[PDB]
Amino acid sequence: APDVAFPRLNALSFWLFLFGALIAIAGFITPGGAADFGWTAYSPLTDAIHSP
């Protein structure tokens, strides 16, 4: 093929990845830090009560 089906969409996909990724990393700059709960992010530990 010459290009993907929706080549402006795949451009959006990359930028959604990049900016979506950055705001997740952004937890570090906050005084509290990034997410305490592991990658799995289990329910009770993730609610507002735990890891606020």
Partner: protein, 223 residues
């Protein structure tokens, strides 16, 4: 009360002995001792939810409470019996007083707020920033008992306002001002938060200036 003390102890033993060690003594470098904190401190802190705290950071954030009013009272009674200290206000029936804490004078409450509270919180009780990751939170969520107990026990990096320093009448006036400023509708439109210069400048640049530039682009011709 005997059963209230027992319930407070049972909640304490399975909630906080890991960081406020059993016997209410504080765990070195995990939590302060609760001897002398009193029932008011427990009520404010647990009701605001800060105390089921799952991190040591710049500031303990607020969160949904982990205990209902009865359990809050049980924990407060347990801590008061162990240490002994300030007690949360209560009304005629026995429940934590909410409306009784609304001082009659609001001009006096506002003056006291500006002299003491606005120092860090805001002109009207919105939040404020502090040195290293700390911040004075918005007061619009706090209920009159929570405001009164916050003054009574300096929660964290907040000056502790004793009854001698701020007579309960002055604290009631401050509570009245806080609630009034929080529940009062913005005259003149949408108060963009409560901070004038910064939200006002952003709203200019985003609402007024994009409107003006878009209208100019409509009227004129690209070239």
């Amino acid at each position: 009360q005997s059963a209230l003390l027992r319930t407070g102890k049972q909640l304490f033993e399975t909630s906080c002995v890991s960081c406020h060690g059993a016997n209410l003594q504080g765990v070195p470098d995990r939590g302060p001792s609760l001897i002398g904190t009193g029932e008011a401190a427990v009520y404010f802190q647990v009701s605001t939810g800060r105390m089921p705290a799952m991190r040591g950071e710049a500031q303990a954030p607020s969160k949904p409470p982990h205990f209902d009013e009865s359990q809050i009272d049980a924990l407060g009674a347990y801590v008061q019996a162990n240490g002994g200290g300030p007690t949360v206000p209560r009304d005629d029936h026995g429940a934590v007083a909410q409306e009784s804490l609304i001082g009659g004078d609001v001009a006096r409450g506002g003056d006291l707020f500006r002299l003491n509270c606005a120092s860090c919180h805001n002109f009207t009780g919105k939040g404020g920033a502090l040195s290293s990751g700390k911040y004075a939170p918005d007061l619009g969520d706090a209920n009159p008992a929570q405001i009164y107990t916050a003054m009574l026990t300096g929660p964290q990096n907040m000056p502790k306002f004793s009854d001698r320093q701020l007579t309960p009448d002055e604290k009631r006036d401050i509570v009245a001002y806080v609630r009034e400023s929080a529940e009062t509708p913005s005259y003149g439109g949408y108060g963009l938060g409560g901070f004038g210069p910064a939200p006002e400048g952003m709203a200019m640049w985003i609402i007024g200036m994009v409107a003006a530039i878009g209208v100019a682009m409509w009227i004129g011709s690209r070239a």
